């Protein structure tokens, strides 16, 4: 995903989340929506499954 | 290094009773914890005596 990172700031770790790494070709069963906003430099994340 | 989305008491960083020297200007050492700032920059390096 990248080679290396320079001098930087703001490293945050959120709560753990489990996934399934097996991919199929069937019909979908869940829907995930995400909204990313940036007001006055302040990052916003809105989501619901 | 910079800390954000976190909280801290520097009292544990003081009662170690192992630091040979200590210097802090601009604010009193005993009344800096209640005073609130935005970000804290940590600048770590080695130097001779
Ligand atoms: C360290 O990071 C800051 C931004 O957080 C940047 O402005 C500065 O240039 C960086 N220092 C070096 C040596 O890259």
Is the CB–ligand 1 distance for residue A47 below 6 Å?
A: no
Give Cα separations from A41 to A2, A9, A11, A45, A48 (angstroms). Answer: 24, 14, 16, 13, 23
DSSP A38: E
Q: Resolution for this model in angstroms, one decimal place?
A: 6.3
Minimal Cα–Cα distance from A31 to chain B, Å? Answer: 29
Locus of tokens 């916003």: A44
Q: Is the dihedral of CA B30, B41, B3, B17 positive or negative?
A: negative
| φ/ψ (deg, to 5) at A8 | -155, -175
Experimental technique:
cryo-EM
**What single string gives the DSSP state of each residue in chain B?**
-EE-S----TTTTTTTS--S-----SS-TTSSSSS--S-EE--------
Minimal Cα–Cα distance from A33 to chain B, Å? Answer: 24
């Amino acid at each position: 995903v990248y080679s290396s990172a320079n001098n930087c700031t703001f490293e945050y770790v959120s709560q753990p989340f489990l996934m399934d790494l097996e991919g199929k070709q069937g019909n979908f069963k869940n829907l995930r929506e995400f909204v990313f906003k940036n007001i006055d430099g302040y990052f916003k994340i809105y989501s619901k499954h | 290094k910079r800390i954000s989305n976190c909280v801290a008491d520097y009292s544990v960083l003081y009662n170690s009773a192992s630091f040979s020297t200590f210097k802090c200007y601009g604010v009193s050492p005993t009344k800096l914890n209640d005073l609130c700032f935005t970000n804290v920059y940590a600048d770590s390096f080695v130097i001779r005596g």
